[PDB]
Symmetry: C4
Subunit: 65 residues, 4 copies
């Protein structure tokens, strides 16, 4: 478990928490977006960035607009 891999898992857990309730998601759009950016940054630091792993979250965010 590389440190970056642990940080990815944590950030994905945080995204699921904030998106779990759409009413809570719509009041925290900026934070969800910032988490998605952080997930990409950490992934690129780990050298395992795959766009397919990020797009589901972007599409969920878009639906919550």
């Amino acid at each position: 478990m590389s440190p970056y891999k642990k940080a990815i898992e944590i950030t994905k857990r945080l995204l699921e928490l904030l998106l779990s309730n759409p009413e809570l998601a719509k009041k925290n759009l900026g934070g969800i977006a910032t988490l998605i950016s952080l997930l990409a940054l950490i992934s690129a630091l780990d050298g395992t960035l795959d766009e397919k792993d990020i797009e589901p979250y972007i599409k969920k965010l878009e639906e919550s607009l």
Copy 2:
């Protein structure tokens, strides 16, 4: 191709989402700001930071106050 370049494109996509609607942008100013900071950080990690690539977003933020 670079993983940082993919993360830059994702972060700009997220900024466009949050700025698309002036009313949603005024409700998420801190999130837009944190995304502009991240865009700058990721750009510096990628070696390529041109201020001219950030400033448009900063002026858009200033517009929403």
Copy 3:
């Protein structure tokens, strides 16, 4: 001494500020989450990420919903 260690201490201070008041924490869930992600990122940059150092904050976040 390490600059990353100072940034870890600052980020934990900010998390304690935002969590001190349950009412302010429920209004800033996305910010608490993004700080927990950053704490993990910075820890991974410093080489030292122990999940046990992050989990208390995650459970506190889950408490505020």
Copy 4:
């Protein structure tokens, strides 16, 4: 102007914008805190983290609670 130094200046500009109006600051506490964390992280990446440069912002945030 090293890329990290440009990112520091941008992040400090963003902090001043969000803190410029206390009424706007109190609605964006989480984003201000996340910006302060990012300022520390970027500073440590540049190898120029001085706690004295960060504390003024933390004290302003505390006053806005």
